[PDB]
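Researcher: Let's try something more involved. This one mixes different molecule types, so please make sure each is placed in the same coordinate frame as the others.
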Amino acid sequence: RVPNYEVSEKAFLLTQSKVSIEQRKEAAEFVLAKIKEEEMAPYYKYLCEEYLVNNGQSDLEHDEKSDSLNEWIKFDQELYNELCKKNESKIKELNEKIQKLEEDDEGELEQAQAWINLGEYYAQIGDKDNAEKTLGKSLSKAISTGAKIDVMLTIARLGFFYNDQLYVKEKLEAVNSMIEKGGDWERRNRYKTYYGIHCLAVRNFKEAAKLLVDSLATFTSIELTSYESIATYASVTGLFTLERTDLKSKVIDSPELLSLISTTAALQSISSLTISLYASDYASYFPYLLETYANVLIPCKYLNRHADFFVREMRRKVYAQLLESYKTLSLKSMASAFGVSVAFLDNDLGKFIPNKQLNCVIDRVNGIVETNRPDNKNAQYHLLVKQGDGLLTKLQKYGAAVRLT
Amino acid sequence: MSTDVAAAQAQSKIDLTKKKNEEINKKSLEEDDEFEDFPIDTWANGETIKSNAVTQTNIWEENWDDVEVDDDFTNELKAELDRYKRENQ
Amino acid sequence: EFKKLDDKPSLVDVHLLESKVYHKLRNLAKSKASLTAARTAANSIYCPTQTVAE
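Model: All components are placed in one shared frame. Result:
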């Protein structure tokens, strides 16, 4: 249960070469200890592939790059020997138990509990395919509705290990069927988070916030990642979705976050960023924003691909907030608050304005920054005509097809 | 994929016995599928797939961050640079 | 463990300190929860004047 994600989390951080020197070498230690002790032997061969062009590599049976920036990476032959031994052993033991459960009738509850143990071993060693097969026999013998739901979650978890978002998605359709058959609120919370993490793994965060702000209140955890880890993810999803008034309630005034405090780096930076967006201290906003890039977005698996998008958005919001409270600004005032140069400021605005969330122009000549307001009845007219343009396209499109019939 | 919603027009139109002949006639006008030339010229294609992952090979929602690089690295330099000038002005 | 050995009005004070802890952790959702439990142990009429002042 416990190494299955924790080894993957550190192993992802270790892969990157776009992390800090220090953070990669701390991770590397946790990964390596856990291969030898827990018998993560096949996923360890797998992980030598996953760098490749990224550095660190120093393996004895698998490729190396010219630049080893790590040495808490080693392949040993003892690892391979062990595999062979341990494999046969676990397999032999349980098998015989299964045959014994066949001789004297006991096989409904106990043979499925034996096959649950077989998929956990299979899962331990990093085989999604053969874990799933064993977890398949568990179903066929007739068991409680509770047990059946617990098993499907485990299988979907093996999807996260190889960081395959589609493998997660497909399995979690089946849980949606059984969830109301058991009718539990306990395994529904697990569902909320399981989904939480899956929605966080894909681009769109709108669903994520909703599931994960709830997952602060009541959490039940069977092969689901730590409560400080879940808190961090929730602050990210809050920021994205919500605006001032709402935001302030949800993720600053939660009793749950306020009792958990900050003690670790990741939680700390994310938390301080969130108060500064609300409180209009824009000075201290950019040091927190930069900390958020290194310590929060990138070592995370479910935000490595959404890190670029999240920071870019953040720059858009904070400047856009400022703009809502202004009709005119000066270039220097605006630049000073951020703690950048006027030249540099024009440059960052000039990527963001065409696409537009800022709703501003800059008069370079009078030395002001001017703010245009299309919010009136004009705004509401533009909203409707566009939504209507689509209805007209669809009506046309289906209609030509039936008129042809 | 195609104009409008590509998903709305694929189910509107599907194979009947009448339709099958017309598919061949259309194909044969230019000749072929016109989708064998790109594999031959390049002799295994080499697309934009390196820049990021919202590139040409993409199967998830686009983030629109392939038309622009990561400016966060740049910003680390811009922030420090400002502090030093500011200090003795 | 002393709640099976519930007979003492000296459990009033323990609930009161738990209330103070959540007060400076600055959540008053949980502050109230322990305050309710303080009023329940002090519903016993054999409590000193000083603990009730608390």
